[PDB]
Amino acid sequence: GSSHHHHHHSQDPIRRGDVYLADLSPVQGSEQGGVRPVVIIQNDTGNKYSPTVIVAAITGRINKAKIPTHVEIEKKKYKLDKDSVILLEQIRTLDKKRLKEKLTYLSDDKMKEVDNALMISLGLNAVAHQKN
Template identity: 40%
Template sequence: MKEKEFKNVRWGDIYYCDLGVTNGSVQSGMRPVLVVQTNRLNESSPTVVVAAITAVKKKTAMNTHIELNTDCGLKEPSMVMLEQLRTVDKATELDNFVGRITDADKISEIKRGLKFAVGIPVKPKTERKGIVLSLCPRCRSEFQSIPENIVKRLDPFQADKEMCDKCQVGYGYDYMIFKKNHHHAKGGVDNV
């Protein structure tokens, strides 16, 4: 496959990937993988960091084992193993696109698991529910201009800007967006 076919690889995308032959407990063979590399690198790098996905759910209590449902394109309920990270070549190792993680709670859970896997301190879970979006300054201002919105930087230490999820033109950071009058209610944000 040609490298240019994968120029739009994004964080949260799921592809099939040939992980080759390995030893021991290292995941191998053709399987789905989750793209966990920042979008800034995804735009320019010929390689991408992925986490292996398996349909065999073991040790689900581990902080690095995150359950995935079929709503992200997988054929069956599975589990991403965030301790099984691998750098692969976009052009020769990534295969068919499967789907994308879009659920805000699942995205937050995966980001927490990644931090745990690489030893970055993780804050305790909060009760607030909302959506997570990468926003450029212009789009962030639009969300902040709505009085009932609370817009909070998800990770104040995030160094790399990512393509804006709203306009797909500018670059910015990840923000949690929730409603002032709904942030403690079960179910999270409505119509953001």
């Protein structure tokens, strides 16, 4: 009986890896979305002090994760009927007013796909994107 974590959250209502539906809507032109589940990839302090959250769009199916920007998630844990794909290229930043409700939750191993795929997708690879 030692609370390393509490019965609700750390303090942050938005937890990293806790999936929120978001009204990703009035997306411009070729931006993909509408009200869909999104993945919270964001830092810790953004939840605390910023009104803005960075998220990545979830897609049911689209194309096999053959590209380092597409990552797939197990229907089994992620609670869909189908294995879903996260598009690390099709991301955005949405303020807390856009986030509706906690739906789903990611695994630590997919955290690593997510964080990491993201840097390939966004070219910030810590080894330099010109060095592969």
